[PDB]
Design a protein around this ligand. Structure first.
Ligand SMILES: O=c1[nH]c(NC[C@H](O)[C@H](O)[C@H](O)CO)c(CCCCCP(=O)(O)O)c(=O)[nH]1
Ligand SMILES: O=c1[nH]c(NC[C@H](O)[C@H](O)[C@H](O)CO)c(CCCCCP(=O)(O)O)c(=O)[nH]1
Ligand SMILES: O=c1[nH]c(NC[C@H](O)[C@H](O)[C@H](O)CO)c(CCCCCP(=O)(O)O)c(=O)[nH]1
Ligand SMILES: O=c1[nH]c(NC[C@H](O)[C@H](O)[C@H](O)CO)c(CCCCCP(=O)(O)O)c(=O)[nH]1
Ligand SMILES: O=c1[nH]c(NC[C@H](O)[C@H](O)[C@H](O)CO)c(CCCCCP(=O)(O)O)c(=O)[nH]1
Ligand SMILES: O=c1[nH]c(NC[C@H](O)[C@H](O)[C@H](O)CO)c(CCCCCP(=O)(O)O)c(=O)[nH]1
Ligand SMILES: O=c1[nH]c(NC[C@H](O)[C@H](O)[C@H](O)CO)c(CCCCCP(=O)(O)O)c(=O)[nH]1
Lengths: 154, 154, 154, 154, 154, 154, 154
């Protein structure tokens, strides 16, 4: 059987992070986690490119530019959506996830999902460096694995 | 670390606004907010191109034409959807959001979302220049930031 | 500020109407409304091309052919979906709306939405020339505006 | 006014049917209905190409191959989805309907929807040759009409 | 009609920020927002003077010193009050707001209110960079506008 | 950015404490806390001036005299108000807090708030050296910080 | 400030794993996770020493022997305790945790805790490679970090 997998040492890997500003008190923790995951897995912080955008809505178009860079091995999308009184959350969450996934397939490059899509503030806090971990760390770790995998698969 | 971000001074930026007429008593307030945001951030009103369409349904096709203009730095989509008795709201809201996001990725240009998708009239009024702010102002401000960001990112 | 808008006089405009036969007792009223709107706004009935198809499912593929005609300025999609006992309604309504919107963006031509998506028969009757107006008339009026707009925007 | 429509005599028409095997005790009735509809409307059974696949999930990829045949005038998609305990039904139903609709627009050829998407076994039986008719017959009849229409429209 | 208003570009403006330490985990987010608002609107971080004090109670006396500086164009008061079991919250909230407003009128200089006065922890988190935005950003933006306005009004 | 802050070593600082006698069994604990805080932070007890007055009502007029002393760096107001059966508590609490805050702004000198304003006896005990700490210690610590801050700010 | 931390690359590190057999269907998944974590972080599987014991009760005495090996950098304790009808769970859980912690302090070597202590079977399954992750992976990852840290700290 042929087996392909990615290891988790990030030496020489170069990452793009696209992080929105809406709910920044939480997003900022996700960004801390993603960078820490990269660095302590052997990646250099100098090999990270961070792009900030207003909201989750704007993440895909920026990610599309980062993912097209030949010297970016994977992109990590970071944002925090918390449902309000209207259906607005649904439409933004739907479009951010679809855009990112579509870009990954079109550009044949990993784009990992570190966007929290929570019903409540409490759920968002839980997933941004408290009791349920840090979604930025998770998405960074995934990006490390996928970039490594792609060294032999792509 | 490389860091890219957009500032919020709008000097020299050129914007497209696509605004629907359904629910115009509210849309009109969103349009006032978007223009004011642009102007008081240093953008010239002369550098704004405003396109009117019948409903949110028609916003994407018009935005597609504006976004293709080489001298438009970003497009701001403005509309007001308020749920009625049928599922019709769902299908229009889904298509307007998908079209705009798809156009942004295909044309590699920011298109911001200033379309209210409310369950009730009250929710719509709240978001059109009353207690929950002005969604047109928010989407304009996002467009200013994204246009600036794109000056170095794109 | 540059301002683009469509007027509502239909002189010289040429329209495609795609109308399904499922629920024809109601669709037929929508078709009457769309034609009347066009004619009494100055459009010639001879400049209308009417295409009939079995159900809403089939509307997109036919509209795709009409919208590709160089001598059609806009297409008006007309149909009546009424929810039954199963989720079938959801999947047809989703695909008809997505197809029409996608075609409009791909062909860069207005395609307006005059498809009723009702939960009940009563809701459908209300929107087909009774208490809530005539969705065909509404979609025709939108098509007139968009075709006019596109004379300067496209 | 120019009027295009398809008649229902199937003489000389050639059809592709893609039929899944999941829930075959019902699918098989849909297949009987579709063939009967074609034959008794004047089509030759020899002009029917039947493709079998495992489940509704696999219907689109096979239909995509049939629809690309120059000597197939329309494709009829036949399957039976019945909701179980999980959301799995939703994702398969969503993808089968979207794939078929997308293929029809991309290949500019009619692909009709004879896939039952039922909440219960009873609903499925009702629509597979019992009290609510036969969805295969319905989709075949639609295909006849669309193929005829396309002789002048396409 | 004579019309006076402030624009939102902060070039050359100099701001005083007085920030308390009680509830610092939240205040610190407010401070981040206020600085970011200033900087990305064109203000220089070097033109910001930040004064820290123990609690909201102490904000006025420090703001009084900052507002008296000839080279400070506006002061931004930042703090977080969260109601406890006693009426203590009421008396501190009343005195901080009255002191700041009184100082502004006496010194004829803008002092903006970025003090959260919440009944619950949750409300405070909402307003400190999560779902209800960032009160520091809001008060900074107000200070930019008022300083600009005062260039012609004062 | 210019940053001003006060450290917490109290060497050379001179404090005024104004302490009321109503509820003295609790006030006395607040006074013990304030003195201890000052001394163990390096302040000399000889540099403390303690003024006693009958009730919280009388605290402001005495504090006004202490705050005017050139050799007093900050004043600490200490008292215990516990609500009784009438609104009397409200009027005394309102006037003590307003007087102290007003004096601080008028004399441009820190006056910290160590007056408990409790609804119940239990709440008062909690805040006077039991489970919720010692409000005198808190107000003393604030005074240390403010006096230090004022060495560079004033 | 001096800062010590461990990175997460496991190159050259040597680990002891002590895994009990009670509830092995779950323990076995924890063991898979711990090994995978080690290997894909750069550790060699050959550098892992696995010791099996009957139950969680016996884990400490075996870990005590592994931790005393000069060529073991850290020990990972793996087990699954699920509460039954009696207090027995409490006493075993108390002694396993105390023994491991005591051994770590006495031998001045990291011993990480990958023992599930669940009230229900469901909770145990959740934490053994399903919805709440894999406690073996978590404890392995901790051991990598601690072993690295101890290269400079110990
Ligand atoms: O990342 C985000 N963004 C966001 N809205 C802003 C949006 O992403 C765009 O920036 C904006 O629409 C302009 O394009 C929000 C708010 C979504 C919830 C709206 C609450 P409501 O339904 O009560 O109006 C979020 O939680 N996370
Ligand atoms: O921007 C819009 N548009 C709109 N409908 C018009 C639509 O966008 C098109 O213009 C029309 O369908 C013609 O294409 C509506 C109404 C949607 C709710 C319908 C109520 P109902 O479900 O009770 O029929 C809106 O709220 N905001
Ligand atoms: O325009 C339409 N079409 C339609 N079904 C036919 C469909 O559009 C296709 O023609 C058919 O599937 C063949 O392709 C229907 C019926 C949809 C509701 C089905 C009820 P059920 O869920 O009880 O089975 C409609 O209301 N409006
Ligand atoms: O045509 C189909 N297919 C199908 N599942 C099989 C699927 O289509 C694929 O063949 C399979 O997933 C392999 O690709 C099913 C079962 C769907 C409902 C699943 C029940 P559950 O949610 O209880 O698991 C169906 O009803 N009709
Ligand atoms: O900015 C602040 N300050 C503050 N108290 C400290 C106060 O501002 C002074 O620093 C102190 O009184 C010394 O002067 C608090 C606590 C207020 C609520 C008290 C709870 P309680 O009523 O249960 O005692 C706050 O939330 N935010
Ligand atoms: O510091 C104080 N002072 C005080 N009352 C005395 C007041 O401050 C003056 O000393 C007095 O009014 C004379 O000027 C009180 C009592 C206030 C509550 C009154 C209870 P009642 O409403 O039941 O009459 C206190 O709790 N703490
Ligand atoms: O790792 C373990 N071990 C274990 N019991 C065995 C024990 O660890 C020793 O091996 C045994 O006592 C012999 O020393 C158990 C069972 C504990 C719950 C007992 C159920 P009861 O209270 O219903 O009797 C476990 O869940 N996980």
């Amino acid at each position: 059987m042929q087996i392909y997998e990615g290891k988790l040492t990030a030496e020489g890997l170069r990452f793009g992070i696209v992080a929105s500003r809406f709910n920044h008190a939480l997003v900022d923790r996700l960004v801390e986690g993603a960078i820490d995951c990269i660095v302590r897995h052997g990646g250099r912080e100098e090999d990270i490119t961070l792009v900030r955008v207003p909201g989750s809505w704007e993440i895909p178009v920026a990610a599309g530019e980062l993912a097209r860079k030949e010297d970016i091995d994977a992109v990590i999308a970071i944002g925090v959506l918390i449902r309000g009184a209207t259906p607005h959350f649904d439409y933004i969450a739907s479009e951010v996830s679809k855009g990112l996934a579509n870009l990954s397939l079109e550009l044949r490059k990993p784009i990992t999902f570190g966007v929290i899509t929570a019903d409540t503030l409490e759920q968002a806090i839980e997933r941004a460096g408290t009791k349920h971990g840090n979604k930025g760390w998770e998405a960074a770790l995934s990006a490390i694995e996928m970039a490594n995998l792609f060294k032999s698969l792509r």
